[PDB]
Amino acid sequence: NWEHLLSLKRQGDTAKRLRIEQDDTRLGFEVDYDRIIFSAPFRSLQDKTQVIPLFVHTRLTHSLEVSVVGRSLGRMVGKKLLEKYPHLEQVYGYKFNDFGAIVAAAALAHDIGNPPFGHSGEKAIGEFFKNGYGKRYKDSLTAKEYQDLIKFEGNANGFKVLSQSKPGAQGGLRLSYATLGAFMKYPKESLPHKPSDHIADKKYGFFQSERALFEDVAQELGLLKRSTTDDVSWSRHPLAYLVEAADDICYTIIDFEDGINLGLIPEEYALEYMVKLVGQTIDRNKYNALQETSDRVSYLRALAIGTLINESVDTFMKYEEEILAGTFDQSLIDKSNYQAQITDIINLSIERIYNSREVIEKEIAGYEILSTLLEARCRALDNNDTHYNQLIQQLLAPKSLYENLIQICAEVSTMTDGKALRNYKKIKGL
Amino acid sequence: NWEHLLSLKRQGDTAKRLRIEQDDTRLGFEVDYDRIIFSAPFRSLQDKTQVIPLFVHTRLTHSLEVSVVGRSLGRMVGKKLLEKYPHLEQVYGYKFNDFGAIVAAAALAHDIGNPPFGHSGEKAIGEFFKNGYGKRYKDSLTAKEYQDLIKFEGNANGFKVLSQSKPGAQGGLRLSYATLGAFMKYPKESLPHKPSDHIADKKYGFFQSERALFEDVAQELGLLKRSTTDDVSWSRHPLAYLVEAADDICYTIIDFEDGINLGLIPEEYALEYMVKLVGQTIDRNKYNALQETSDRVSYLRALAIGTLINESVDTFMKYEEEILAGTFDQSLIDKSNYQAQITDIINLSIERIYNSREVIEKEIAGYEILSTLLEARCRALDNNDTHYNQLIQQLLAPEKSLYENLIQICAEVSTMTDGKALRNYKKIKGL
Ligand SMILES: [Mn+2]
Ligand SMILES: [Mn+2]
């Protein structure tokens, strides 16, 4: 039910928060966005690389653009949802901007827990615990505690970042449960691993340390169960599909834009790859009058993103009842009439950007930087009495074993590119 | 006996050196100072870090300031000792500046054996032999030889630097035995480890390689034997307490000063922590007229050092007979009426300087630099036959026991300036 899915609950609440009694200048969903903007984890995205080493998008500007696309998706979907379910507005007091605000906030935070150097950063952390120094802990951990480490997931670390309790600050950012639900695109634990080909099963969305919190979130929202074993799993909050589409749209089109501006993709390819996405709306005489590459490609990007937003809204509304019943199996973009063109764009970016020598060099270096930092933290954990290990604790980190290891991963993951490289260089004498 | 404690003997001497027969213009104790100044090991302190990386004090300017403070301590104590025991001057010919000379020279040399990167430097060397590559030598060494390595001690390496013979240079710098006695603030071997809580038992002062040398020094000075087993130790030469006091006074107050001028310690802490130490001697009109932070804090530093020197002289004379009998169980500064203020100063320096990111980072890097140089030297020692290991020997060290080879490797890595250690390190790693 949408009334439950739009929960304003915050962690620890003892009483219900009715939408009709909200102060509209202090709307819980919009406070959520402001809390993320000013948070230390969001600010650190300023100094973190998205794909191409550091104009190129950093994590912060990527997340900003995704939240803008997400707000537009949520606004347009919210308006059609309120005309489909008019009791949501007439009885309960919901407004179209509420949906825009939920998606905008979840989208703003979607990459907040990701480690440096991208997917290699996650693999480097995983490999450290699978076959590196961290392997020795296996027998002291449950299967799921260990799986959290060997398949260390940035989405799950983001949920920890958003909700972590510390002295003086229980509940992290204390976001609305509707926002936490829109954030959670993999509502399952680390095991079982990929139980189906469904997008929501491709990874997992919370660590064992956050399991009890997401249990509270899922019951408050009324999310549908996807497992009746002790391995817990739920169907995605409907608005998580819009967070994912905003993200899909932005890195597809905007990585392409960056690749052209950086000279990694020949400009000769720009129209060829964008023509079907922009063909009906492009003012071609205007395009031909633009004198700078960056102006031409930003014009194409805006048209293609506009095309994909409108189509994504229609796809959501067309499958709304399957999404509400937890039986929708794909992403919104999987259903696009432009799936062939999106795939061509992504494949060109893989060939020209992700496999460029510079991106490869960064990923290889990132493996050495993260492995070194994890080994130093973990040896210091195992022997905190030696002089060297006390120095290491003082430089990098001034509980149960699992809690200690998952915290080490979270702290390594949240270091800025320059801070991780500086610490690595000092540990190695440079 | 003070007549034997003030020995002018140098290594290898075949005849006695009477104080009454010394040429005043070439006094043995004063020549010791000149020999240290011009030595290669002392010069190398130019380019060696004390706490903060490279105005900031280096090991050289620190050692210089300690020797000046030590010269005053020894002059003042020397005057009072000669009034207490007038026969030392009237019969034996000793003068109060002799005591200043002995303390000043020993204090000038007190950090001459210290490795680069501070006390993390020593710990990095010990860690190499405890848990690093050097652990493989444990079963080929005696317990005290291995302990020399895993608790590698800058003070013991200093004694090696000052005294060790080489072809054409028997006896090292050949300092007077009274000076070597005042240098030795831990007169014991590496084992047993901390047999008591007395400051003199905290560390050790000579390697096994130098045990026979200090036995000669201790016998000539008449130091009281403190241990009777095959584990040897002696009660400290009385003047070693003054060397230790001058060192304690300097790094306590001067590190604090440095930390304020670097911005690590807000200036307001200066007056607050040092008001007791300066209040009876400070000219407030002068203080209030000084316009620069660095001028205000250096004035407070001068006043606080002057206060602690005077007090330390008094403490020494109060416990002089217990020190002469080897029953004094503390440092002179441990007895200070300002121990509350000294402790506060040290704790803030630890928090704001020693634990600063800059120092932590430098110490962490030094561990890797020293471990790498040590491993290259030991691998080349273990397999001198390979082309690579011959290149390493040409680069870093262009017939003795395994223990003597390992102690020399440690001494030579310790001799390197910060810069030369980094360059050799970079070459080995190819940077
Ligand atoms: Mn993203
Ligand atoms: Mn010193």
From TrEMBL, chain A:
GO process terms (BP): dGTP catabolic process
Coiled-coil region: none
Residues reported to bind Mg(2+): 62, 110-111, 247
Superkingdom of the source species: Bacteria
Binding site residues for dATP 1: 26, 34-35, 72, 301
Record-annotated HD domain positions: 59-252
Binding site for Mn(2+): 62, 110-111, 247
Record keywords, A-Z: Hydrolase, Metal-binding
A GO MF label: metal ion binding
SMART domains: HDc (SM00471)
Binding site for dGTP: 50-51, 59, 155, 185, 203, 255, 354, 363
Alphabetized NCBIfam families for the sequence: dGTP_triPase (TIGR01353), PRK01096.1 (NF002205)
Protein name: dGTP triphosphohydrolase
Source lineage: Bacteria, Pseudomonadati, Bacteroidota, Flavobacteriia, Flavobacteriales
